[PDB]
């Protein structure tokens, strides 16, 4: 649901070189 | 249950009481009392300034509840006229009407009792009292008292528990409590102990006859093994001891006093007798105390309790309280408390002893004569009164100049806040004294009350036949008996027929003078009386006469001074006195004696001293506790001086201590008068503390006096005149200084008083009207400059005086726009109803204010800063109160109730333009205090200002952002209750909860009336919560009441008051609809009672509402009342089974607890403390923990069954383990340990410990010296406190000590083990941690050894070398934190290694710049406003009433003059903005990109309804695309159920899921957002109600499809051995089944395994035949069995195919090393060696290919600076990467130290890898390199750059670009050299955050048709189609579709329940090779399957060591191809 902000496609909060998603939750 | 190592020994923490009103000094000890069953006895060691001599020490209390006759008056009559006082000391009045009764509990009585009801006229506590007396004469009467919860307490029925004349049997004066019994038939029996004359010596006993009315608490019995509702001992028999389990024993020196015995509950000793005797006198006859208590037993019965274990001594010592005292002849102090614990073995273990101190009485170190300036002018000399006429505090000049009267009352001299005193300009006092007659009364200025009375020669009715020199004298009234007015019994003949001259020989002490004795002419120098006559005043010219209190009692005794003897008639009230009392001591010859010279004042200020005037020189007398005087203490005058009858000596309290000086008045030397003070500081008061934990205390004290002169000072600077209202001076606390010797901070607080008061018509101090508290910091040298202001705490209390309390509204803080102020409420109680009253005549007016006393009115929180809103205040409070009256049947007193009606709440945050206002309301209570309608009211926001107030480093327009409409909203939340109340003449049980109903209103801003919302607008006709107007409803509850018989709710609660279940609301009508759509109309009601909902009426209903859905909850069984009523069985909802409690025989614990499905968990327990010791668990395992004597864990072991076996730590019987005590030799135990854990404590090492050698070096007799005057113990300490004051007195040691001055000290610390494995030889080892504590336990630091490595190290003076070196014991210390005296860390430091456990000291490393440290600053409520990290960036927060401003580290880097764009960070934090409710509703961004483009404004919106759970929110991009169309969907809308459980998720994104919530808080129900519908089944109601299995339906099946299946294990004896005990074995999940094989005692899976499904099989899993479902699996069967240490950690596991990885851990726990075992292959190694960080983050690696791979790590930040890999073998760099970061952490710089490759033809340099990003910190660029032959960047995969190819590498860069909503839309990727620049989109859609790439489409009104309604993309690109399952799982794909329906590539998967993908499957219909992949993922193993149709083309097996993503090792093994 809504534990990483709004946007339910977003990556990383668009910081992709700084950190990192283990589970995609 | 116990402490698994996270919890410790609680630290005393004996904060000072805040006493606010009364500023005394107070304290609270608590006595080691066990609970037991739950009943005990309260008892606290109390102390207070103002307390006097007790059975434990001056100022020192241990109050009982007891009742007593009123002291008010002289002494009680005896007579029905007397009144009684409350155990809170109130008076009482009757309550309804007597009743005769003979009947008590069942007892028969043996008299007609007259019963008469009592309550308190000032009631808080609502309980009712009782008063039996006998009718007919021959027995005792006795008192009961109802309280509120059920209890009887029985008061004074036996003649040892009641205080009597011993004369008169008949009279008695307190009423000391006997037994008592709770409701739940849980006794209390309290045996007292009369006085006797053991031990005391002869002198006291003939001089003291009839001394045994005096009682002392000795024996308190509770814990009774009976049950039984009936007060014990109501016949008047000895308590038994076989009927009680608990016994709290007072012993007062008989058991022995030592370390080495425990005492003995049966006692024989002798009862010893202290120095400091003394009597009360108070209630007509003499109450003499001579005792002292010297310890707190508590025994426990443990034959009784455990019936394995004989008591042969008796009931057993289970905690000791020794109290040693400091015991001299003037008084007694307590100065020692220490808790002690004997062992079983004989051996004892201490804490640390708490030391206190008292001010001394040094009068020849602290007294020299000095000369009184001021008196220069002061021609007078021989003649003149200091008294204190006014009452303002202070003994003014009292004189006659010129033949007419005047006064010079007190007043400051110079600087305000020194205790210098002058007086002021003399005053006319216009009331003649020559007026009256001799010895009468006269008044002041007219004065209501007569206060003093006047001698004099020219008046009337004067007889000195024989003066030497007489005049016009005043003298204190209050000094001389109170029967002075009428005098009756000796007063009336003493005084005969008139007094001549009253003269003063001190502050109280009035000598006497008898007139000529009309009737008898002689005049002997004796009168006659009962008890051997009396003396008559200056008839014997040689002795003197006079009034004066010598016994310290509060009576003025008659004493007789003679040469030789001094002699004291007492005062026993009503003109009484007593038999002489011969006072030795004092003795001077017979022919210079003259009672001239002679004097009385109290200087001690404990009796009233003596004095003796020389011509030369003056000797005093100290009061021995009115028994006697010590040796003479002779004090020479000034020098050169002669006095003689012409000079004056008065005693009298100059300073204002309440102790006398010495006021000198001489003729002929220059200056006249002259001036000695014996003491600057009151003495006899705690003013020093330490608890030897680092913590000392000190207090300082300042009186009342000199606060009303600063009062009047500061007053006088304004053109006004104070009045003061305290005619008697107060010692008030002022300052009290927390220091800690382990961190060096202070916390001084200082207190100032104003506007005191007292009442002139009850003789009772009221208290101030003003409070100020101020609270400083100041810490030590080498700490950071940033000083945190002192708060200020102003607080008003209403004193009861309408003159005080009207005229405190003006040192308030004013406000133009605040609400009406307060006003006292007066109503009284008609018609059950509270109404309002206007005080009816002067009488009513005082006893309604005075119900007031003691409340606070005002509280404004200050801050004491440099800043500019340095006068405004934080927080701001204030409350009414309400008096309510109940009675008016007795003339004397009214009956009242002083409450608190409303409270309003200020929250200015030093803003006084836009406040946060709150208030809570109760608009109506019951006849018993319950409240009936309460209301909370959140105030809207304040009209934005035309001037901000605001600061202006504030970013643009974030002021004008903060403002939203729902901050602008009035909120009522009205709230109705109803409750249960048992009223009977012998049954009192009140405030039990019926019913309750919350409801809230909403109205506009509008609404609100100028001054605000009171109690009286809301009691009106048109109101805003009038029955007629709109309201919403929040919810409604109720209890249910069972009588323990049947499970039936009854109407009426019984005594016992039992709880059958409660009863709360879930659902409404309103709240139903978010179920339209997925639920019908005809099941939703079938489907809601399905899940165990009910319905029932609204509870207090209005018209149209009915049957609420409701839940109820808390199913208890009670056992019957000869258990307690103790709970059998428990239930949480109807639809889980019940648990079953199995208590002991006593019924104390529960010992046993069978579950629902029969599992049982037995409890063996220790009853010195009632804590369970050894746990037997589901699975039989058993779990032993042994504790020390004061209940401390130990050890730990846990044995049990694994496989079947029996293996685990070895049994006490097995193999036995004695636990060490010391910490340096619990360290060099070795491999090994048969005990989990060994806890080894050390909480007394902050003082010093003298080794045995230097104490031979020290005699017997020397320390006989040190050991006597308590300074050092019987063990190795040193008590810091007295060895500090016997440095400062006695200043030359007889001993030299080297452990004090540094030396080897530490903070209390403690030792913890933890072995890994069990006894069958392991590597073992053993984990070492040691913790650090303070004063006020919190951790200091954590030290951890570690195996080998190099560090820093420690001095052993306790400072840090920073130079680091190899050393055997790593010892990483973690955690290090210093804290403040308030418990916010003000210090935090990075880990590190130092050799050896020892603590470091502070002031070393503070300092020391390399220790990398972070500071924090906080502000005076407790947030965190600063935070100051090591490299220098701060992160701060700005807090407002409305929003909070959170920047970042490079927020503040602009700020940071004192990374690459410190201008483009400036002005973008974050802010969130909070409603009146305080719930966030927006958070603010700000977007820039260049250091000159202003930012944008991002605003994401969250709206909260009136219930109060997220309703809507909607992020940037939606609202402004919203804010052109009001018709768009936000991005979540839920819908809730009145709890908050979310009903209904309505997402554009991920479409609509409902959801029903069971009454456990299961998914019953759950509809997806595609239309599946998912429904789960439970056990039934006769179990724990887990999940059995799982249903789901799309819309397009008809019947459901069962996709999970769950199996639990049994209870068999079989299923324990593999400790699988309520566990599922066996789990059908969608993918295949795990069965559990086997678990291991720590719960880790031993042995496991899976079978995967058929290809062409769904799961489904229908019926109950578990055959045809293992029909559907497959033969191959992977089982992965591992075996594990103690610590639950991995050791080895084997996988499906038979590989072994072994896993050896370090002392630290942490992975030093892997090995892999291949099937028919031998060991090799895949990790060689590990070592860590301090962090504990990973610092170096060799691996099996023998490449070391070396960490970095930012010691500043602990952050990753850099990896280097190398390869030793040829010395070559293979990669070297060094990251670069900014001060939040983003990671902007990479760059690589290594050589290029050799795939890289004519390559050497690599370049680097930089990034820039946003405010937003969105990755906006990127420099990397890419390989020329990659092209555009798509989904299909590049080709590998060979050897042969001579491949190259070039430089790119990308720029995105980010949609308002946080989408990426575009990628510019640009290389220079290749040529290959490409752009890729992504269309956003309009209404949702579904992108696409471009190529599908770019229209943004399209995209949402690629999307299903679970948000799912359907389309992965053209022509690849994408199916999901019914979880939201990716199902399959179709990469290349071929036509004529053929079969395509595809590729499809499977996942088990929680999703982990288990099967891979991927399709090639190529015509040459058709080739199918299948991948089968296991536990650390890959099953890589290809088969064409013609035959296996390869079987490979991949297998995995180590995580992913953290230097895994693939293996892979190829069975074929």
Redesign the interface.
Same mark, same amino acid.
């Given at each position: 649901?809504?534990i990483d902000?709004?946007?339910?496609? +977003?990556?990383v +909060?668009?910081?992709?070189?700084?950190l990192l998603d283990p589970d995609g939750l | 249950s116990l402490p698994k190592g996270g919890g410790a020994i609680t630290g005393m923490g004996e904060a000072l009481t805040p006493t606010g009103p009364d500023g005394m000094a107070a304290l609270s000890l608590p006595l080691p009392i066990s609970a037991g069953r739950g009943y005990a006895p309260a008892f606290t060691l109390n102390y207070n300034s103002g307390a006097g001599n007790s059975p434990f020490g001056l100022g020192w209390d241990c109050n009982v509840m007891t009742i007593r006759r009123r002291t008010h008056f002289g002494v009680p009559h005896y007579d029905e006229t007397d009144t009684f006082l409350g155990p809170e000391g109130e008076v009482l009045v009757v309550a309804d009407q007597p009743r005769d009764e003979s009947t008590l509990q069942g007892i028969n009585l043996g008299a007609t009792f007259t019963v008469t009801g009592y309550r308190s006229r000032l009631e808080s506590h609502f309980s009712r009292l009782e008063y039996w007396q006998p009718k007919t004469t021959g027995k005792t009467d006795f008192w009961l008292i109802y309280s509120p919860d059920g209890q009887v307490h029985l008061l004074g029925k036996s003649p040892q528990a009641r205080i009597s004349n011993p004369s008169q049997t008949t009279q008695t004066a307190q009423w000391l409590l006997e037994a008592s019994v709770s409701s739940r038939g849980e006794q209390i029996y309290y045996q007292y102990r009369a006085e006797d004359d053991t031990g005391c010596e002869a002198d006291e006993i003939t001089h003291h006859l009839q001394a045994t009315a005096q009682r002392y608490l000795h024996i308190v019995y509770y814990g009774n093994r009976t049950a039984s509702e009936t007060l014990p001992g109501l016949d008047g028999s000895a308590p038994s001891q076989a009927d009680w389990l608990f016994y709290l024993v007072f012993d007062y020196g008989e058991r022995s006093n030592n370390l080495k015995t425990p005492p003995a509950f049966s006692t024989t000793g002798s009862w010893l007798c202290r120095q400091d005797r003394f009597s009360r006198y108070e209630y007509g006859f003499e109450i003499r105390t001579r005792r002292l208590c010297r310890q707190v037993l508590m025994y426990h019965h443990l034959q009784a309790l455990d019936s394995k274990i004989t008591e042969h001594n008796g009931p057993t010592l289970v905690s000791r309280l020794i109290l040693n005292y400091d015991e001299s002849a003037i008084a007694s102090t307590l100065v020692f408390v220490r808790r002690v614990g004997h062992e079983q073995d004989g051996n004892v273990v201490t804490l640390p002893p708490l030391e206190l101190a008292y001010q001394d009485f040094s009068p020849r170190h602290h007294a020299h004569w000095q000369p009184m300036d001021v008196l220069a002018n002061f021609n007078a000399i021989q003649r003149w009164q200091l008294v204190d006429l006014k009452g303002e505090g202070l003994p003014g000049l009292l004189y006659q100049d010129k033949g007419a009267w005047w006064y010079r009352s007190a007043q400051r001299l110079g600087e305000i806040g020194s205790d210098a005193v002058t007086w002021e300009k003399m005053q006319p006092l216009s009331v003649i004294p020559s007026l009256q007659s001799n010895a009468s009364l006269v008044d002041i200025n007219g004065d209501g009350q007569l206060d003093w009375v006047i001698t004099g020669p020219g008046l009337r009715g004067y007889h000195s036949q024989r003066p030497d020199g007489s005049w016009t004298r005043f003298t204190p009234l209050n000094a001389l008996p109170v029967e002075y007015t009428h005098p009756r019994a000796q007063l009336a003949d003493l005084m005969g027929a008139g007094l001549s001259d009253l003269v003063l020989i001190g502050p109280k002490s009035v000598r006497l003078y008898a007139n000529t004795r009309d009737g008898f002419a002689k005049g002997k120098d004796v009168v006659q009386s009962g008890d051997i006559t009396l003396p008559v005043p200056g008839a014997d010219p040689r002795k003197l006469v006079a009034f004066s209190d010598v016994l310290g009692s509060g009576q003025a005794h008659l004493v007789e001074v003679s040469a030789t003897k001094v002699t004291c008639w007492p005062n026993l009230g009503r003109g009484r006195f007593g038999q002489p009392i011969t006072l030795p001591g004092f003795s001077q010859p017979a022919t210079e004696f003259n009672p001239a010279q002679v004097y009385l004042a109290d200087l001690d200020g404990s009796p009233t001293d003596l004095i003796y005037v020389h011509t030369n020189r003056l000797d005093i007398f100290l009061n021995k506790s009115g028994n006697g005087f010590a040796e003479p203490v002779t004090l020479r005058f000034p020098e050169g001086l002669r006095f003689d009858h012409t000079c004056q000596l008065q005693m009298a309290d100059v300073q204002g201590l309440g102790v006398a000086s010495l006021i000198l008045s001489v003729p002929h030397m220059s200056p006249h008068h002259w001036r000695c003070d014996l003491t600057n500081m009151k003495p006899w008061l705690l003013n020093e503390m330490n608890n030897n934990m680092g913590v000392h205390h000190t207090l300082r004290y300042r009186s009342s006096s000199q606060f009303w002169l600063d009062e009047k000072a500061a007053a006088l600077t304004t053109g006004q005149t104070p009045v003061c209202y305290l005619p008697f001076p107060i010692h008030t606390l002022w300052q009290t200084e927390t220091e800690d010797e382990i961190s060096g901070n202070k916390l001084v607080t200082t207190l100032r008083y104003a506007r005191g008061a007292w009442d002139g018509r009850e003789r009772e101090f009221r208290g101030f009207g003003y409070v100020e508290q101020t609270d400083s910091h100041q810490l030590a040298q080498g700490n950071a400059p940033e000083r945190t202001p002192p708060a200020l705490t102003k607080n008003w209390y209403a004193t009861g005086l309408p003159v005080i309390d009207n005229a405190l509204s003006t040192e308030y803080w004013r406000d133009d726009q605040a609400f009406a102020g307060f006003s006292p409420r007066f109503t009284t109680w008609q018609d059950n109803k509270d109404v309002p009253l206007t005080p009816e005549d002067d009488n009513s007016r005082y006893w309604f204010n005075r119900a007031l006393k003691g409340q606070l009115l005002r509280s404004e929180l200050y801050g004491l800063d440099d800043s500019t809103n340095k006068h405004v205040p934080y927080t701001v409070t204030e409350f009414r109160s309400q008096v309510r009256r109940l009675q008016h049947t007795d003339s004397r007193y009214p009956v009242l109730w002083s409450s608190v009606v409303e409270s309003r709440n200020y929250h200015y945050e030093r803003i006084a333009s836009d406040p946060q206002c709150s208030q809570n309301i109760t608009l109506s209570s019951d006849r018993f205090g319950q409240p009936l309608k309460q209301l909370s009211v959140q105030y809207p926001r304040r009209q934005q200002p035309a001037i901000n107030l605001y600061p202006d480093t504030l970013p643009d327009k974030l002021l004008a952002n903060s403002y939203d409409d729902q901050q602008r909203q009035l909120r009522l939340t009205y709230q109705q209750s109803s409750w249960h109340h048992l009223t009977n003449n012998t049954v009192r049980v009140l405030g039990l909860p019926d019913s309750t109903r919350s409801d809230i209103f909403t109205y506009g801003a509008e609404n609100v009336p100028a001054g605000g919302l009171n109690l009286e607008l809301l009691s009106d006709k048109n109101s805003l919560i009038a029955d007629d107007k709109p309201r919403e409803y929040l919810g409604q509850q109720k209890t249910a009441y069972t009588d323990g018989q049947n499970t039936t709710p009854l109407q009426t609660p019984t005594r016992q008051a039992l709880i059958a279940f409660t009863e709360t609301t879930v659902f409404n009508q309103s709240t139903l609809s978010a179920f339209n759509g997925s639920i019908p109309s005809d099941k939703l009601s079938t489907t809601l009672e399905q899940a165990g909902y009910q319905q029932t009426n609204y509870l207090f209903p209005r018209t149209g509402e009915d049957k609420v859905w409701v839940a109820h909850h808390g199913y208890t069984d009670y056992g019957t009342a000869a258990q307690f009523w103790r709970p059998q069985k428990q239930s949480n909802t109807q639809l889980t089974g019940k648990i079953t409690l199995i208590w002991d025989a006593n019924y104390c614990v529960v010992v046993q607890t069978r579950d629902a499905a029969g599992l049982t968990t037995s409890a063996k327990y220790d009853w010195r403390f009632l804590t369970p010791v050894q746990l037997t668990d589901i699975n039989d395992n058993q779990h032993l923990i042994t504790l020390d004597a004061l209940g401390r864990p130990i050890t730990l072991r846990f044995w049990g069954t694994e496989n079947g076996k029996m293996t685990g730590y070895s049994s006490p019987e097995k193999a036995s383990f004695s636990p060490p005590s010391d910490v340096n030799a619990a360290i060099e135990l070795k491999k090994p340990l048969p005990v989990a854990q060994c806890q080894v404590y050390a909480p007394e090492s902050w003082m010093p410990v003298l080794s045995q050698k230097t104490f031979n070096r020290l005699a017997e007799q020397d320390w006989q010296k040190l050991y006597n005057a308590r300074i050092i113990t019987e063990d190795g300490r040193i008590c810091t406190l007295a060895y500090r004051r016997w440095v400062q007195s006695q200043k030359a040691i007889p001993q030299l000590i080297s452990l004090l001055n540094n030396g080897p000290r530490l903070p209390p610390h403690s030792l913890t083990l933890t072995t890994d494995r069990y006894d069958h030889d392991p590597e073992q080892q053993i984990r070492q941690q040691v913790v650090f504590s303070d004063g006020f336990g919190r951790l200091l630091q954590a030290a951890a050894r570690h195996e080998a490595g190099m560090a820093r190290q420690r001095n052993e003076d306790g400072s840090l070398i920073i130079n680091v070196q190899h050393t055997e014991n790593r010892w990483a210390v973690t955690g290090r934190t210093e804290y403040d005296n308030k418990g916010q860390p003000i210090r935090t430091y990075q880990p590190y290694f130092l050799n050896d456990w020892r603590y470091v000291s502070n002031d070393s490393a503070r300092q020391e710049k390399e220790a990398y440290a972070d500071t924090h600053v906080y502000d005076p409520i407790g947030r965190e406003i600063k935070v100051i990290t090591a490299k220098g960036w701060f992160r701060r927060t700005l807090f407002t009433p409305w929003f909070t401003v959170n920047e970042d580290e490079n927020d503040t880097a602009a700020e940071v003059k004192k990374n690459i764009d410190p201008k483009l960070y400036q002005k973008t934090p974050t802010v969130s903005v909070y409603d009146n409710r305080g719930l966030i509703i927006r958070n603010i961004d700000f977007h820039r990109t260049t250091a000159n483009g202003d930012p944008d404004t991002r605003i #994401?919106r969250h709206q909260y309804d009136i219930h109060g759970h997220l309703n809507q929110?909607i %992020?940037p991009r939606l609202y402004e695309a919203k804010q052109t169309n009001n018709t768009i969907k936000p =991005?979540?809308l839920w819908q809730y159920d009145l709890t908050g459980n979310p009903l209904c #998720?309505e997402?554009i %994104?991920?479409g609509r899921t409902v959801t029903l919530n069971d009454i456990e808080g299961r998914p019953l129900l759950t509809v997806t957002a595609t239309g599946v519908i998912q429904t789960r089944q439970y056990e039934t109601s006769s179990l724990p109600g887990r999940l059995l299995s799982v249903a789901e339906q799309t819309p397009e099946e008809k019947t459901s499809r069962i996709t999970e299946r769950l199996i639990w294990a049994g209870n068999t004896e079989a299923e324990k051995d593999h400790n699988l005990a309520g566990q599922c074995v066996r789990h059908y999940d969608t993918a295949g089944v795990t069965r559990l094989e086997s678990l291991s005692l720590t719960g880790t899976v031993l042995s496991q395994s899976s079978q995967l499904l058929i290809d062409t099989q769904e799961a489904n899993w229908t019926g109950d035949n578990e055959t045809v479902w293992q029909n559907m699996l497959a033969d191959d069967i992977y089982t992965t069995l591992s075996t594990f240490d103690a610590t639950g950690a991995l050791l080895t596991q084997t996988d499906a195919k038979g590989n072994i990885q072994r896993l050896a851990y370090d002392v630290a726990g942490q992975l030093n090393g892997s090995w892999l075992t291949l099937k028919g292959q031998t060991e090799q190694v895949i990790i060689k060696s590990l070592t860590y960080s301090a962090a504990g983050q990973k610092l170096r690696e060799e691996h099996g290919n023998d490449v070391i791979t070396e960490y970095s790590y930012e010691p500043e930040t602990q952050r990753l600076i850099g990896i280097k890999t190398r390869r030793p073998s040829d010395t070559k760099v293979l990669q070297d990467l060094r990251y670069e970061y900014d001060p939040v952490? =983003?990671?902007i710089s990479?760059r690589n130290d290594a050589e290029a490759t050799r795939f890289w033809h004519n390559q050497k340099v690599m370049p680097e890898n930089t &990034?820039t &990003?946003d405010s937003?910190?969105? $990755?906006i660029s990127?420099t990397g390199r890419e390989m020329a032959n990659i092209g555009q960047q798509s989904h299909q995969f590049p080709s590998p750059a060979l050897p042969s190819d001579n491949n190259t590498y070039t430089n790119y860069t990308r720029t995105?670009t980010?949609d308002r909503?946080? =989408? $990426?839309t575009k990628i510019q990727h640009s290389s220079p050299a290749t040529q290959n620049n490409y752009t890729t989109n992504i269309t956003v859609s309009n209404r949702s955050?579904?992108?696409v790439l471009s190529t599908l489409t770019e229209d943004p009104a399209q995209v949402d048709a690629l999307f299903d309604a679970g948000?799912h993309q359907n389309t992965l690109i053209s022509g690849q189609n994408l199916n999901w399952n019914t979880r939201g799982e990716l199902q399959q794909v179709t990469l290349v579709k071929r036509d004529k329906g053929a079969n395509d590539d595809r590729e499809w998967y499977r996942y088990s329940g929680d999703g982990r993908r288990m099967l891979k499957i991927n399709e090639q219909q190529a015509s040459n090779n058709a080739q199918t992949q299948r991948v089968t993922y296991l536990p650390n193993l890959e099953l890589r399957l290809t088969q064409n149709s013609t035959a296996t083309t390869e079987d490979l097996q991949v297998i995995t060591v180590g995580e992913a993503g953290r230097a895994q090792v693939r293996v892979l093994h190829w069975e074929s191809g």
């Open positions: 649901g809504t902000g709004l946007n339910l496609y +977003r990556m +909060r668009n910081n992709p070189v700084t | #994401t929110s %992020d =991005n979540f #998720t997402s %994104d991920a952490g =983003n990671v990479i &990034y &990003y937003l910190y969105q $990755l990127a995105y980010y909503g946080g =989408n $990426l955050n579904r992108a948000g």
